[PDB]
Paper text:
A HEPN (higher eukaryote and prokaryote nucleotide binding) nuclease Las1 and a polynucleotide kinase Grc3 assemble into a tetramerase responsible for rRNA maturation. Las1 and Grc3 are highly conserved proteins and have recently been identified as core enzymes involved in processing and removing ITS2 spacer, which is a key step in the synthesis of 60S ribosomal subunit. Recent studies have demonstrated that Las1 is an endoribonuclease that contains a HEPN (higher eukaryote and prokaryote nucleotide binding) domain responsible for rRNA processing. Grc3 is a polynucleotide kinase responsible not only for Las1 nuclease activation, but also for nonspecific phosphorylation of the 5′-OH of the 26S pre-rRNA produced by Las1 cleavage, providing a signal for further processing by Rat1-Rai1 exonuclease.
Numbering used by the authors:
A (entry chain C), B (entry chain D): 2 to 167
C (entry chain B): 65 to 139, 165 to 301, 303 to 618
D (entry chain A): 65 to 139, 165 to 618
Amino acid sequence: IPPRIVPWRDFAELEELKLWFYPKSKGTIEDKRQRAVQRVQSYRLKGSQYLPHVVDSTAQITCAVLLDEKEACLGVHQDSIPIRLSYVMALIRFVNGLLDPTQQSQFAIPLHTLAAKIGLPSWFVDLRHWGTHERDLPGLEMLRWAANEALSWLYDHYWNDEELED
Amino acid sequence: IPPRIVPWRDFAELEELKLWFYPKSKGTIEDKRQRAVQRVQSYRLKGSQYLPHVVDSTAQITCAVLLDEKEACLGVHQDSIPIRLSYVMALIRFVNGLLDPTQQSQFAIPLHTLAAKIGLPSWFVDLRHWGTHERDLPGLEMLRWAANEALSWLYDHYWNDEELED
Amino acid sequence: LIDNITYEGDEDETMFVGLKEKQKLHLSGVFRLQVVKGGIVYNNVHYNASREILTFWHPLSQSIPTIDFSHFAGWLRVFNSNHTGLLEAGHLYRDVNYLWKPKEPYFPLNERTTYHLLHESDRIQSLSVPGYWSTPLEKLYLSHKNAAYDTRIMVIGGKNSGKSTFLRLLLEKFTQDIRDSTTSQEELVYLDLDPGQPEYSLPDSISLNKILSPISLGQHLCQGSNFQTLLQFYAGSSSPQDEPTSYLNCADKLIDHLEEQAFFGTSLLNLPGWIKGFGMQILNHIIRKYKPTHLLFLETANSKRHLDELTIPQSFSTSLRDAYAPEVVRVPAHSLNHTLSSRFHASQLRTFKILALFHKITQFDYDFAPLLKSAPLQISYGKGKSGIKGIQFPMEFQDLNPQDIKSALEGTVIGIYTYSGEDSLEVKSLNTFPILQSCTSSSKNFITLGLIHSIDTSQQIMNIYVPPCHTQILDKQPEDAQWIIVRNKTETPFCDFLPSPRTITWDDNIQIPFATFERRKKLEHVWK
Amino acid sequence: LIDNITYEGDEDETMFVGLKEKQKLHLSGVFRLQVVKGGIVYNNVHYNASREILTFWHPLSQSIPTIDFSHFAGWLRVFNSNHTGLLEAGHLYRDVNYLWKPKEPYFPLNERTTYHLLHESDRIQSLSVPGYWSTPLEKLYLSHKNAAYDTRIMVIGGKNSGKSTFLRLLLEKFTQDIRDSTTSQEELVYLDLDPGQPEYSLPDSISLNKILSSPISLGQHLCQGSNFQTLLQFYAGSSSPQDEPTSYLNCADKLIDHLEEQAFFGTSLLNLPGWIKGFGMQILNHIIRKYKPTHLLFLETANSKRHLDELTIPQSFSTSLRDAYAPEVVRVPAHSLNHTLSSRFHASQLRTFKILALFHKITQFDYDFAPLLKSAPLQISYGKGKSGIKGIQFPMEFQDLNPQDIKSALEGTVIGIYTYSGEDSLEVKSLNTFPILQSCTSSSKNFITLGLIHSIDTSQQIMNIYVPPCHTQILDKQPEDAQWIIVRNKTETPFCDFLPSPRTITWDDNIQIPFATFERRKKLEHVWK
């Protein structure tokens, strides 16, 4: 087994990210997802080619989820479209980095059965063209639902699943 | 010449929209570029089937451009991950709405040919993948210069031209 | 087959039909039957008729169930509809002119007749009940009477699956059974949860409805007046995808009304298809909530691969403490056999329902002159307020310029609401438009749709169109009641927004807003 | 067809060649030849036998040109170049092990020879010179002497089209004309604005650098040649300009002006990044009016050329200078090489070799390819004032990089060292004792060398760091009062340097390797590519 370069200084750092992204039974004052996002921001700084896609997507979806939480005076110019703009790339980049890489080739297994193989439910295949090709952006509620479903999916399949096959 | 439903009441309400979108003023009272987006946002209320995509995208790109211009201890200077996502959304939807409707123009013709027909720069075609099929989002200034280019192209080829063929 | 004799007059142009041996009768349109002798078989059911009137609705949108003759014993009939201005619906909206009658039939057209014979020449689809499709349904009826408990049915299937026909058949034969059974008070309740294809509900709406003689069948495009609406909510869109949990919240509120009234007996509901997409997640909560005694699936060669995990994961054993049962069956059915549209797209048919709603004087009367001719009954919105106290917008359009609001509302279909339970008004004022702030307001009553004509800020009033059928439900309502406007994405019909010559001459000086006549500039194409 | 004159020549493995033989000479490696009698032809260029030494770099990455014989009249020759450690890079980087020698050569390989003979047996091919490129090239010969004025050539062509080879051919063509013309003091000034496949510049960098007429070097030395002296350089920090376009253009604008600062008159060269399909149609338009190209060239032809037609015409101007008052356009084929452009040597595979060879470049021509971890990194005290480092620069993003996570971000990353020139005032924000440029800008700084951060001690406020030993002691020549800036940009540290093979370096087993893990990657953590 050849060593791979990983941004984190230790596996304990990855456990700490796991705890940070998904708070245990408390999210009021101990939310601590802004700082986990700031950590993955450094992971991007060291090298983006080093960072696994699942960690990148967990950070990016959480970026958008923390983005939509702004309810303080004075009233901001934002008309709630930037949040809807942000979720669409968060989720599309998420679903694309699971299907496309390692490795897209001239012979490619169809996307739906790729999702079935990796365990991704087949409704995630659709949100690639759900946002980019549809005329109007999806409702903020539907995007919120998709993001909170995707984060749970990553927790179930990568963060808290110890399959080492790849 | 069948009648068309359009959200604006008359030409004098769309003529001022063009002036608002391209004021040539940096700031203060003369700049009314937020108001143009707040008005296209009301156009989406009655629509969005009457609102042309050339105006929907002019408003989305401008909303993102206004989004990254926050300079008072708030907004973007704290974290600049939302802006890249918003530019990617605005530019991808702008490209898609013209290049790939598959209704107005003949189907199966390659995208570069349609970009030649409508006069779109050839590099706007590659703006589709841009942030969707690559590991890392494009650089922040690379996005700004492309958003400004798209707005200039829209102003030159739609808000000015006297062609009524379509 | 040789056509029967024709009896003109005195009214309704009633026709008498005689078929040698057993023949499939093809009749299209709205018509009433009073079968003196013999047995009628409409889709392998028995309708023995003795001086009872049976109203039939046979649009060309769906495959018309042919009327079969059976013993015993035979060998006014097909009398005209009580509805007056439904057919002239082709005049206003010219994409629906052939819904009741074919285009170029091998019969002379008549303005008096609202029914038309179809002697296989029009090549239209009249495919009858499949045998294979009958067996799974026949099993539910052997379980309808010996269940000894309330029976709740769900049916699952996307567009083009044939879900609506299956529920219709269930409805007619259930209502035949309850009439046969004496004395049965188990009045079945239809719980329309499908804003995509309304049945028994207002456009872009969700409705729990009581289903009650006279006989009506089978597909009446929500115009049947064979049902009484117990409760309704305004989803405001043709797809729950736009507001998933809001639609789920409305469905939860509607289903809970069933236990609120403590109803026991037959009850049905159709969920939106959602065979492929977020439907896997959307159905896992409503199956859990409604406690369905019979699940039904129609995907077959759709294919069925997408909608598979729901039956195992979402079943959760039996939700009901008393029913303690579940059913999981699959059937193969692609109806109709021909193209699903049948020259009637779902979006094309959806416009007809709105148009007919806005033009109905009452259940049995229709007047399809443009509402621009009709007076727009007005309401005063104030800061008090008396009448309209709040205006609601979808969440993403919650930061909007006060100046543009006046232009946004006019010419848009809206939902009128009553505050119902007494609480704080909680409304924000923008250019004298009381925009409802923070949304919420869970406790509301949805009355009807409305089409806003104009707004007078100085007089603080709104000239607004409501269907004449509801009047005077709006008037028969307490004066101090608070009234709310919810403008969600409901599409106003184009032929109704601006009329044309040969309908209204208009005036030369008058300039029509929101409509332009100049040829569209290049690149003004709307994204589709 | 038979090998001849395999002379041992004791140390350096010198050998002689038969000249009048009808078989063209083909040779590969880093060598140097001194011809005794008779004319030689390297890429349709004639070199006399006037006992002058010529260094030759013949990597297998590019198609290797043959050496022809020509009258008159013939029949130390070829011998090892003074590069001791360059050939052993294969011991450190496994991929580049075959850069100078073929895999199976059908020839007795000798470890003591930097040059190897190849005769039609190996998979490689010799490009020679295409006839199609010949005519415009020999015409552009005639526009040097007869011009009697400054002739600046700007050449555009996409990756794998072969702009580098044409520009090389042009460069030796001008250098030969300089040597044999008296008095010709118009030494070439190359202008590498391409960080993707850079020649004559630092990794992920941009450079305006003078080209020395002597000693003779042909043709492609993978930036390891000694024939160029750097006048000015800037750290783009990215493999592609598209990451920082406006910065890149600014980095370009500062280079061109330097050429007027020297009041340079004579031939100058330039290669832009290809960008045949994409943003490029605009980027060139910024400096086509700025560079004043007297001889603009195009290469793509059947690329197709559908993209570089409308922009080049809009960019072209009738007269952008009083003296030149002209512009030229020419199109030539792009097929180079005939075989696959990669030739088992991808651009990303060769950029890594260049970065690796930089950090192991001891002196002008001596390389020590032992892993960096054996070498002792040097230290600078970044502080509050400070004297060691005044500020650390990051791209526009990553600005909320919180103070307690900065340190582990820096370690193991290639950086660009900068000196801050005459300062009106300092601009620094201190986060966990790390000085960071909050507003960026600061255009007055000048780039010195790349660096690889090894470790950071927050207590002592020191910064262990590796710099190429070639630059040392250029860092020491700088005044002590001069401020230092550490710029982080997306430059990929070589994998072998970051963690060497266990055979190369033996560590204590208890010592933990911080930024690397040995566990099998969990399903499914895969890097998006």
